[PDB]
Amino acid sequence: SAKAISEQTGKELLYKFICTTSAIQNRFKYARVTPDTDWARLLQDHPWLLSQNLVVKPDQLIKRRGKLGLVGVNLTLDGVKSWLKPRLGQEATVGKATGFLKNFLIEPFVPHSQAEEFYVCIYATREGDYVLFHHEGGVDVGDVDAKAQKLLVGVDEKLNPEDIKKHLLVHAPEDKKEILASFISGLFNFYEDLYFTYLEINPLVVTKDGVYVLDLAAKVDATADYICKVKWGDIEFPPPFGREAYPEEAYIADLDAKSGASLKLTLLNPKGRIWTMVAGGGASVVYSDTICDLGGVNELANYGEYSGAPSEQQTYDYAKTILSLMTREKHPDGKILIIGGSIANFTNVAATFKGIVRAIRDYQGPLKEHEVTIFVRRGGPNYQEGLRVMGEVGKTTGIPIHVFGTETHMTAIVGMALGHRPIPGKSTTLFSRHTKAIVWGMQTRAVQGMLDFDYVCSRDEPSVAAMVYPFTGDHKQKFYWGHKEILIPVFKNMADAMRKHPEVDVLINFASLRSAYDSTMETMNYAQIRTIAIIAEGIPEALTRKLIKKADQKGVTIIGPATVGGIKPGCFKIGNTGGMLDNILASKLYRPGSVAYVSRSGGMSNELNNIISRTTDGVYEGVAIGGDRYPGSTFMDHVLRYQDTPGVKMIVVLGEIGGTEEYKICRGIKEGRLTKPIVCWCIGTCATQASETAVAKNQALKEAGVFVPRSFDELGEIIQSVYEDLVANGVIVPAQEVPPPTVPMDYSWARELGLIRKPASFMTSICDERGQELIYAGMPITEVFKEEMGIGGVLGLLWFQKRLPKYSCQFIEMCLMVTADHGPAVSGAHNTIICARAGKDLVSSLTSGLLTIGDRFGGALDAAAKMFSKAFDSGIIPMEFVNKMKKEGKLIMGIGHRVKSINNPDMRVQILKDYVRQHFPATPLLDYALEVEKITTSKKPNLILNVDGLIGVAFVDMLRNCGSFTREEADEYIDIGALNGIFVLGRSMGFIGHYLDQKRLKQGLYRHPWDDISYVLPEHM
Amino acid sequence: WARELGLIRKPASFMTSICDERGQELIYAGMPITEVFKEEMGIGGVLGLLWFQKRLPKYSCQFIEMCLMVTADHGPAVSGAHNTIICARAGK
């Protein structure tokens, strides 16, 4: 896609990046004035505006300004100011377009004679680049193809300056020959290294001082940005000069760029009654052409798309925008909405119609008020359910909605809505049944579709032999062969895939637009690969021309780029062409037919399969050559291939506007090379070079002898008529219909539309990973951070599933910090240190001590909480608990230090006791426990409440008396084991810190002293 | 029900090739447990079947058993046995 740029941007790029021995004058001498900006700042930032004479021109992509006189030449400052007074900022027109005039380019005027001027133009064609030059200056340059000098330079070819001198400068004046040679060489290099498509400099003032550029136009390959974004800087593409964009049109435009979907909307008549909301660019072209041809040319409101599987929000917004625009002004003859569409490849029709029905139900008021009628036609996955829900809402909201499926032709509904009809060495055999393909990329969906097509076509071997993915190791992917499981090898290099599968002759390159070129070259370096199908869309045209050249030299057939692929029923299917097996079975694409079709875009291919299946025997072969304007295989290269094929009996061709291609078919049939019946119809009339239009092409085909219909509506009718023309003579014999093998429904597909149940295990309630944001209990992660709850808060949410009050969260944090570490001598830290000094990883190392926890190391927390609980809630007063446990011969857990005591407090029990006292509401078990410690510290004085005990009791008392748990919940948590989770968590920090330490100290393997073992082995066993 | 009569497909993960619990008998490689015991292959034989998926010759099975016996223990001072003793001595 070559986009025209503002002449200022081309001027700047020429100034920065030209390279020639001669000197270019007036470098960085230009200015731009808009009605939105004043003059003083521009009059001061460029100090050369008061040095010489100036010339001003409209810099808004306006052609042939010299004949129409929209340029002010040889005028000084106030002269151009007074010239701009009646022009700068209001409605102006040129040719047919009317619109606001926004930009002016101002250039220091160069004194030039009429003989010093020159004409140059470099434009890219399919086979190379044309450079064109005339020496007789001015506008009067005469015919350029005979008197001016042309030069075709090939692709990947270097321009010799001697060739420029010998072939281009034959009639140029001798004085300026040597400077123009270098200038043209530099201009060609500048053209070639910035991927320009069109570069026309007119006129070119070459005086004795040097070279002067005054006016030029440039169209640049917008797809090559990834190569030259650093070179073009901040490139800008101006819209064609015309009327202002409506608020709703700009709304849709900005709503398109936010996603990966294709959303288009352009108004033709804002007060019209026929509105099209159709999926597929070719589909919109077809509906627009049919309505314009069927008398709705003066009433068709707009054209546009919603494609690329738009989201439900995108579809809702697009539908409400398009419906609000038809409810502004009403119409005496009613109003029509046409929700058309091509046959969907894989997108579920039901979901799109759910979005559309939601929008229609929300906008039904004005729609009923304005007396609108909705015609909906669609096909693809689960189109029946979508039509059912559309009819259900048509009966519900009262808006008359007429729903149709694949059985009806595309543009019948627009014939029904308007009331015109009543409303009810290149080879010829690319693919054989022994064909195998290598798929380049992780495209498991496409490969599975190919395998399903192979199985339903009764093939004996899969058509995918191996997959190449450079970003992973060599392994095997598990795929389906009907019911069976098969393993398709995935390789990292192309080389080993090629060697292990020497009989593979097709490569389907699923690479991106910036990786298809080199991959395709590397594939061409293997002689066994006879055809390459390039699916990527957006490869720059120069790289595509290099691909075409190398394919021609190596005899490889390229299908693409920017193609969906080609489908040969019963034999082969490239990637995703045809769609899922619902479309393949609906269009009877599992058995060969006798009609071969060649299309340009991939959106019309599915409709062509539908039409050919429902009107004739069926499709024998169908190839979409791609939407790029340098396709790897033209129409001719495939029509000759079909002519050489004895299997086919008639050929359908569907081209578009632009490109002298079907004239080659005309020359072929008048030459007599093509004899089989050819039906064709070039879509894209849109007449609302003169030979490039679809109407002229259709004519030339009609008088050439090709059965061209008057519109698309009778395309199926004319192919049917050719079908009787060929079966009456007895050359086409309809084959007997054999039922195809059936594949089971996919589980994911059968659950998406919900005809099946599977019970789900792993009930979970602490995190919801899916959706827009992480949800811990019921509050999203953003609300977790905005409410400023810390780690204690997320333990509340994840462990107890409750938004705990602030003091309990801070207490959880506190008891994590006191638990964090207690030295390396203890058993768990010992295990972590031993495993960390044995070369093991953090997980192993720390989890070793993690395991070590539980009973004797680590289990006093719970042991006390569960003891003191059963002591408080059973009535025993503090001193009958001290005495019951003596008698039971057990010790109280939670009571007992070794060195600390009355007078030497524990200092970690004092920080935490003082928070549990100052901040907690009621602490009834910390009181019972601090009374059992009066009875026990009377005995020995070091029998105080240990940190274990305190944390235990204070957590039982925050769980029970805080306000969120209900004393059964708060007693499940104590039993399930949630106090062994606090200890564990705390130790985990310390444990890791003893891994990270013994790893910084680089300590080695620990062999235990043997003097500290005392082997007690038996005598002789 | 829909899979019993086979109108649906679900991809199965967890390819396994060392044991078949389902069916009449346990099958280690392809050789049932009764054949495992009738051919008198020992623990080395079932390492051959489960680990390498092959019915190893008799000397290979006996050598695997031998190298398991020599590896069995090397005292309590070494690091791993130290960790096992520490964790066993903590009541786990």
Ligand SMILES: CC(=O)SCCNC(=O)CCNC(=O)[C@H](O)C(C)(C)COP(=O)(O)OP(=O)(O)OC[C@H]1O[C@@H](n2cnc3c(N)ncnc32)[C@H](O)[C@@H]1OP(=O)(O)O
């Ligand atoms: C110059 C000279 O020295 S000559 C002086 C001559 N006199 C002496 O020699 C007297 C010196 N000895 C003593 O007085 C001492 O009492 C001793 C050494 C006999 C024993 O004293 P203690 O260490 O207090 O006894 P013990 O170790 O059994 O502990 C006392 C209590 O702590 C309790 N206790 C210990 N740990 C815990 C625990 N974790 N939870 C609850 N209770 C506990 C025990 O149940 C015991 O209870 P009891 O008194 O009801 O049986």
Ligand SMILES: O=C([O-])CC(=O)C(=O)O
């Ligand atoms: O088949 C494709 O690649 C295109 C597709 O799914 C869709 O958007 O309908």
Ligand SMILES: O=C([O-])CC(=O)C(=O)O
């Ligand atoms: O917490 C435990 O049960 C063990 C411990 O840290 C200590 O040695 O005091």
